[PDB]
Coordinates of C-alpha atoms and ligand atoms in Angstrom, one line a residue:
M1 CA 0.0 0.0 0.0
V2 CA 2.3 2.8 1.2
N3 CA 5.1 2.6 -1.3
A4 CA 8.2 1.7 0.8
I5 CA 11.6 0.1 0.7
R6 CA 13.7 -2.0 3.1
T7 CA 17.4 -1.5 4.0
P8 CA 19.5 -4.6 3.1
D9 CA 20.4 -6.4 6.3
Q10 CA 24.0 -6.5 5.4
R11 CA 24.0 -2.7 6.0
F12 CA 23.9 -3.5 9.7
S13 CA 26.5 -6.2 9.8
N14 CA 29.4 -4.2 11.4
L15 CA 27.6 -1.9 13.9
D16 CA 29.7 -0.6 16.8
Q17 CA 28.3 -1.5 20.2
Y18 CA 24.9 -2.7 19.0
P19 CA 24.5 -6.3 20.2
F20 CA 20.7 -6.0 20.5
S21 CA 18.7 -8.7 18.6
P22 CA 16.1 -7.6 16.1
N23 CA 12.3 -8.0 16.6
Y24 CA 9.7 -7.0 14.0
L25 CA 6.0 -6.1 13.8
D26 CA 4.5 -6.6 10.4
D27 CA 1.2 -5.1 9.3
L28 CA 0.2 -3.0 12.3
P29 CA -3.4 -1.6 12.3
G30 CA -3.2 1.2 9.7
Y31 CA 0.3 0.2 8.5
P32 CA -0.2 -2.7 6.0
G33 CA 2.9 -4.0 4.3
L34 CA 5.1 -2.1 6.6
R35 CA 7.6 -3.8 8.9
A36 CA 8.6 -2.0 12.1
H37 CA 11.8 -3.0 13.9
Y38 CA 12.3 -2.6 17.6
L39 CA 14.5 -3.8 20.4
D40 CA 13.1 -5.8 23.4
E41 CA 15.9 -6.2 26.0
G42 CA 15.9 -7.3 29.6
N43 CA 13.3 -9.4 31.4
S44 CA 10.2 -9.8 29.1
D45 CA 8.1 -10.3 32.3
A46 CA 9.5 -7.2 34.1
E47 CA 7.0 -5.0 35.8
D48 CA 8.7 -1.9 34.3
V49 CA 9.1 -1.1 30.6
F50 CA 11.4 1.7 29.4
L51 CA 9.9 2.9 26.1
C52 CA 12.9 4.6 24.4
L53 CA 11.8 6.9 21.5
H54 CA 14.5 8.2 19.1
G55 CA 14.4 11.3 16.9
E56 CA 15.8 13.0 13.8
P57 CA 17.8 11.6 12.0
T58 CA 18.7 8.7 14.3
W59 CA 17.3 5.3 15.3
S60 CA 17.4 2.9 18.4
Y61 CA 21.2 2.8 18.0
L62 CA 21.1 6.1 19.8
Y63 CA 20.0 4.5 23.0
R64 CA 22.7 1.8 22.9
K65 CA 24.4 3.2 26.0
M66 CA 21.2 3.5 28.0
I67 CA 19.6 0.1 27.2
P68 CA 22.1 -1.9 29.1
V69 CA 21.6 0.2 32.2
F70 CA 17.9 -0.1 32.3
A71 CA 18.1 -3.8 31.6
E72 CA 20.6 -4.4 34.4
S73 CA 18.1 -2.8 36.8
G74 CA 15.7 -5.6 36.0
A75 CA 13.5 -3.6 33.7
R76 CA 12.3 -4.4 30.2
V77 CA 13.5 -2.1 27.4
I78 CA 11.5 -1.3 24.2
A79 CA 13.3 0.9 21.6
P80 CA 11.5 1.1 18.3
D81 CA 12.6 2.5 15.0
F82 CA 10.2 4.9 13.4
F83 CA 9.2 4.1 9.8
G84 CA 11.8 5.7 7.6
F85 CA 14.6 5.0 10.2
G86 CA 16.8 2.3 11.6
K87 CA 15.7 -1.2 10.5
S88 CA 12.1 -0.3 10.0
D89 CA 10.6 0.0 6.5
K90 CA 11.0 3.4 4.8
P91 CA 8.1 4.9 2.7
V92 CA 9.6 6.6 -0.4
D93 CA 7.2 9.6 -0.5
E94 CA 7.8 12.4 2.0
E95 CA 4.1 13.1 1.7
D96 CA 3.4 9.8 3.5
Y97 CA 5.1 11.0 6.7
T98 CA 3.0 13.1 9.0
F99 CA 2.6 13.8 12.7
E100 CA -0.3 11.4 13.1
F101 CA 1.4 8.8 10.9
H102 CA 4.3 8.6 13.4
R103 CA 2.0 9.0 16.4
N104 CA -0.5 6.3 15.5
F105 CA 2.3 3.9 14.8
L106 CA 3.5 4.5 18.4
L107 CA 0.0 3.9 19.7
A108 CA -0.5 0.8 17.6
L109 CA 2.9 -0.5 18.8
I110 CA 1.9 0.0 22.5
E111 CA -1.4 -1.8 22.1
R112 CA 0.0 -4.7 20.1
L113 CA 2.7 -5.3 22.7
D114 CA 0.3 -4.4 25.4
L115 CA 2.9 -2.2 27.2
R116 CA 2.1 -1.2 30.8
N117 CA 4.1 0.4 33.7
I118 CA 5.8 2.5 31.0
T119 CA 8.7 4.8 31.8
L120 CA 8.5 7.0 28.7
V121 CA 12.1 8.0 27.7
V122 CA 12.2 10.8 25.0
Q123 CA 14.4 13.3 23.1
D124 CA 13.8 15.4 20.0
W125 CA 11.0 14.0 17.8
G126 CA 10.8 11.1 20.3
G127 CA 9.4 13.7 22.7
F128 CA 7.4 15.8 20.2
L129 CA 5.5 12.6 19.4
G130 CA 6.0 10.7 22.7
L131 CA 4.8 13.4 25.0
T132 CA 1.4 13.2 23.3
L133 CA 0.9 9.5 24.0
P134 CA 0.0 9.3 27.7
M135 CA -3.2 11.3 27.3
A136 CA -4.6 8.7 25.0
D137 CA -4.1 5.8 27.5
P138 CA -3.0 7.2 30.9
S139 CA -3.3 4.0 32.9
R140 CA -0.3 2.6 30.9
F141 CA 2.2 5.3 31.8
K142 CA 4.0 5.5 35.1
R143 CA 7.2 7.6 34.7
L144 CA 9.0 9.9 32.3
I145 CA 12.6 10.6 31.4
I146 CA 12.7 13.8 29.3
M147 CA 15.8 14.9 27.4
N148 CA 16.0 17.9 25.1
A149 CA 12.6 18.1 23.6
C150 CA 9.2 19.9 23.9
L151 CA 5.8 20.2 22.2
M152 CA 4.9 21.2 18.7
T153 CA 2.2 23.6 19.7
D154 CA 1.5 27.0 18.0
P155 CA 3.8 30.1 18.5
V156 CA 1.1 32.0 20.5
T157 CA 0.4 29.2 23.0
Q158 CA 4.1 28.6 23.7
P159 CA 6.6 31.0 22.0
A160 CA 9.6 29.0 23.5
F161 CA 8.6 26.0 21.3
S162 CA 8.7 28.1 18.1
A163 CA 11.5 30.7 18.6
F164 CA 14.3 28.2 18.2
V165 CA 13.1 27.5 14.6
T166 CA 14.4 30.9 13.4
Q167 CA 17.2 31.9 15.9
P168 CA 20.0 31.3 16.3
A169 CA 21.1 31.0 12.7
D170 CA 23.5 28.1 13.7
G171 CA 20.7 26.2 15.5
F172 CA 17.7 24.6 14.0
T173 CA 18.2 26.8 10.9
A174 CA 21.6 25.2 10.3
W175 CA 20.3 21.8 11.3
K176 CA 17.4 21.9 8.8
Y177 CA 19.6 23.3 6.0
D178 CA 22.1 20.4 6.5
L179 CA 19.2 17.9 6.2
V180 CA 16.8 19.2 3.5
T181 CA 19.2 20.7 1.0
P182 CA 22.0 18.2 0.1
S183 CA 21.2 16.1 -2.9
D184 CA 23.6 13.4 -1.5
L185 CA 23.0 13.7 2.3
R186 CA 25.7 11.9 4.4
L187 CA 24.3 11.3 7.9
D188 CA 27.6 10.0 9.2
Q189 CA 29.0 13.5 8.4
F190 CA 25.9 15.2 9.7
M191 CA 26.1 13.4 13.1
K192 CA 29.9 14.0 13.4
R193 CA 29.0 17.7 13.2
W194 CA 26.0 17.6 15.5
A195 CA 27.5 15.1 17.9
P196 CA 31.3 16.0 17.9
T197 CA 32.0 13.3 20.5
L198 CA 31.1 10.4 18.2
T199 CA 33.8 8.1 16.8
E200 CA 34.2 7.3 13.2
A201 CA 32.5 3.9 13.8
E202 CA 29.6 5.4 15.7
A203 CA 28.9 8.0 13.0
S204 CA 28.9 5.2 10.4
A205 CA 26.1 3.5 12.4
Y206 CA 23.9 6.5 11.7
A207 CA 24.6 6.2 8.0
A208 CA 23.9 2.4 7.9
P209 CA 20.1 2.6 7.5
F210 CA 20.5 4.6 4.3
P211 CA 22.4 3.2 1.3
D212 CA 21.2 6.2 -0.7
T213 CA 18.8 9.1 -1.1
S214 CA 15.7 7.0 -1.9
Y215 CA 15.8 5.7 1.7
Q216 CA 15.9 9.3 3.2
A217 CA 12.3 10.5 2.7
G218 CA 11.5 10.2 6.4
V219 CA 14.7 12.0 7.3
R220 CA 14.0 15.0 5.0
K221 CA 10.4 15.3 6.1
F222 CA 11.0 15.6 9.9
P223 CA 12.6 19.1 10.0
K224 CA 9.9 20.3 7.6
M225 CA 7.3 19.2 10.2
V226 CA 9.0 21.3 12.9
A227 CA 8.8 24.3 10.6
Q228 CA 5.3 23.5 9.2
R229 CA 3.0 22.1 11.9
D230 CA -0.4 20.9 10.6
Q231 CA -3.6 21.5 12.5
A232 CA -3.7 18.0 14.0
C233 CA -0.2 18.4 15.3
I234 CA -1.0 21.7 16.9
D235 CA -4.2 20.5 18.5
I236 CA -2.7 17.3 19.7
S237 CA 0.3 19.0 21.1
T238 CA -1.8 21.7 22.8
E239 CA -4.0 19.0 24.4
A240 CA -0.8 17.3 25.6
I241 CA 0.3 20.5 27.5
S242 CA -2.9 20.4 29.5
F243 CA -2.2 16.7 30.3
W244 CA 1.3 17.2 31.7
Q245 CA 0.1 20.2 33.7
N246 CA -3.2 19.1 35.0
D247 CA -3.3 15.3 34.8
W248 CA 0.2 13.9 35.1
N249 CA 1.1 12.6 38.6
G250 CA 3.9 10.2 37.8
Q251 CA 7.6 10.3 38.6
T252 CA 9.7 12.5 36.3
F253 CA 13.4 13.0 35.5
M254 CA 14.8 15.6 33.2
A255 CA 18.3 15.8 31.7
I256 CA 19.5 18.8 29.5
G257 CA 22.3 18.7 27.0
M258 CA 23.6 22.2 27.8
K259 CA 25.5 22.7 24.4
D260 CA 22.4 22.0 22.4
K261 CA 21.7 25.0 20.1
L262 CA 18.2 23.7 19.3
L263 CA 16.3 22.5 22.4
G264 CA 18.5 23.5 25.3
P265 CA 17.6 25.6 28.5
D266 CA 15.4 28.0 26.4
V267 CA 13.0 25.2 25.7
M268 CA 13.7 22.8 28.6
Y269 CA 12.9 25.2 31.5
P270 CA 9.6 26.2 30.0
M271 CA 9.0 22.5 29.6
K272 CA 10.0 21.6 33.2
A273 CA 7.4 24.0 34.4
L274 CA 4.7 22.5 32.2
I275 CA 5.2 19.0 33.6
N276 CA 3.6 18.7 37.0
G277 CA 6.1 17.4 39.5
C278 CA 9.1 17.7 37.2
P279 CA 12.1 18.2 39.5
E280 CA 15.3 20.2 39.1
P281 CA 16.9 19.1 35.7
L282 CA 20.3 17.4 35.5
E283 CA 22.5 19.7 33.4
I284 CA 25.0 17.8 31.4
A285 CA 27.6 20.4 30.3
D286 CA 29.4 18.4 27.7
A287 CA 26.2 17.1 26.0
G288 CA 24.7 18.6 22.9
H289 CA 21.4 17.8 21.2
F290 CA 22.0 14.1 21.4
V291 CA 22.0 13.7 25.2
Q292 CA 21.8 9.9 24.9
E293 CA 25.4 9.9 23.7
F294 CA 26.1 10.8 27.4
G295 CA 23.2 8.5 28.2
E296 CA 24.7 6.0 30.7
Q297 CA 24.9 8.9 33.2
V298 CA 21.3 10.0 32.4
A299 CA 20.1 6.4 32.7
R300 CA 21.9 5.7 36.1
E301 CA 20.8 9.0 37.7
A302 CA 17.2 8.5 36.5
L303 CA 17.1 5.1 38.2
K304 CA 18.5 6.6 41.5
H305 CA 15.9 9.3 41.4
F306 CA 13.1 6.9 40.6
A307 CA 14.1 4.6 43.5
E308 CA 14.4 7.5 46.0
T309 CA 10.8 8.3 45.1
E310 CA 9.5 4.7 45.3
Ligands
BR21 BR1 28.0 15.0 21.5
BR22 BR1 23.5 8.6 5.0
BR23 BR1 13.9 17.9 12.8

């Protein structure tokens, strides 16, 4: 149905520090012919599930330093790849990717796997999309670990979640330029620039899902959605603000990548205030937009905080 392609499996043969076995979900309600990849580590019968949602232009490989930590604590870890990323199938037409297309996939994934006692772990698009999930089925969500992200509401409702789109010139403006303009986009080069701490091998892992341009429709469409937010995205995100403010009563942990020119303190503090009960954020000085690359520390501290509140 949705015209899509699949990344040859050989592309993933030499990943660095990615020993997690593949699991797949074929023909999800509303996603016929599409195969979604996800990780399922730790005790399958654990009473706690850490739902790790990735962003642009990464995949579950991003959480590779956090997964082991949550699993060692006795919890189950679910890290899916959005359609267009990682090992999931990738629609060829940008016009197929929308806010609700990625959101409904997440909701369908949760129902199918009947996830409960969820500790929502988000960053970037993982959060733009993830933070809107709980209000649809609140009984399923227990905790939240928020890293550099926010809600795609309109400029009037929350100016802090729109201002970063235009300024600074070297922030989202630069980011989106690097993504949507190159005819021959090299994500390993992109990530080495936006995550200066990565090694050559680690950057290669981010290029792995895309042999060429035809596999990058999902990558190109993401920043265009941050710039142009449809009505559903605005309504859904606006309704999500009211949820975190008036309905949320779970444990929360926040971590900020201080060097992030896109979703740092400017967006994160307004966010912290919107989330009822959100404590004092952990500020990681050396971290940029991809906080998960400094994720072992985030993961460990989040567990300590969660335990001290048990
Ligand atoms: Br970095
Ligand atoms: Br690439
Ligand atoms: Br983006």
